[PDB]
């Protein structure tokens, strides 16, 4: 059976003081049957590693929120896979909705980043999802197919991939996603991955839910047959992120 | 008379070990009449601060290679001015040629970033410059005017601004800029700032040269009347960056 994956995307948040307090809480988490990652900002990755230190259970690992399309060189403002590996970071998000929406990350850029990450041995959390206009006009499945076809173009091996479904339509719009709707989207993603690859590959692929996750709804969502964990937003900046990890046990 | 400014842009380069060695050299620099900044990647800022420690000569300060357009929040992959201030970083590059060229930073995004940086108390190194096609078609001045007009739109106070002129036409093209050509571009920039503001403001504004700078040419360039220091690329990842600082004495 698939090992569950619980990620905490800090986004553009954190201070030295707030992260010190938060990581002190996370060090109290004694064990997990799931993979557990937190994704601080690039500015905070080394600090967060220092805060964890060695006096912890080895439940939490650290990931990046983004990776450069290129390796080292004349890429002002960018951070490369090789730099991350030097820092002992073995995972990154790619194609988060916010980067697609705000920073001109196209499907083709996302493909480039997935390939770059996987080639450098990183675990890549590929983010996909449709907007409210797309959902309301019946294009959910068209969008998921396009995003997968393009993001995974010439990507042969999914062993180090995880897919996060972001119900963009249900984030900040006043519209709310039910667990049933989440499950339906995850089942469809898995079904398309079967077509693009095969049933063995799709059966092994973790598909994590990247909508609104809190301590109040995580236990219901994780039971859904095609939901294999979470990519958590704001709830990952609170000690009760531990309750979300516990739901995945 | 203007205080000179020597910046070292590391771009997307560095490892823990290589930076440890480099900063150990930079700590040997005993004094400078110039402002001195190094701009590591965001991943490396806290480690570079560690390596300098708390008993060095106080010659070097640390800057960022980029800042977010927005403050904290749901901006995956971005690092904000407020985050930089929390880490005691007081300076950033904005509008570097590589970000304009590769990451879709328009003049309007650059304006947004200059305003956001300055409003948060950061010293902003605004980068401008024209391409080889622009230079060869006679558009150098048109391009500089446009870039300044847009980047400084509604920017009233230039006390925390520095401008870096990047002769993009002379970087990676096989075409080489002479110090005379650099001087001519710097003089034009200052002349246009006079028109946009006034001669007091333009006489106080540092305009630093962001073309090819090494220990072999820095002494000739710094003597130029309108060249007030440097934004150095690859030469800033070597101990001999110290020789470039020394040219600005
Ligand atoms: Na499940
Ligand atoms: Na000069």
Residue numbers in the entry:
A (entry chain A), B (entry chain B): 2 to 250
Reproduce the article's own wording on this structure.
Here, we present the 1.55 Å crystal structure of the apo form of TIM from C. parvum Iowa II as part of a structure-based drug-discovery effort. CrpaA.01119.a.A1/TIM crystallized with two monomers in the asymmetric unit. Interface analysis using PISA confirmed that this was the native dimer. The fold of CrpaA.01119.a.A1/TIM is the typical TIM-barrel fold consisting of a barrel of eight β-strands surrounded by helices. The two monomers are very similar: 249 Cα atoms can be superimposed with an r.m.s.d. of 0.2 Å. In CrpaA.01119.a.A1/TIM the active-site loop extends from residues Pro168 to Ala178 and is in the open conformation. While the ‘open’ conformation is typical of apo structures, a blob of extra electron density is observed in proximity to the active site of the CrpaA.01119.a.A1/TIM structure. An unidentified blob of electron density occupies the location of phosphate moieties of ligands in other TIM structures. However, phosphate or sulfate from the crystallization buffer can only partially explain the extra density. As the identity of the ligand could not be fully established, we deposited the structure with UNK atoms in the active site.
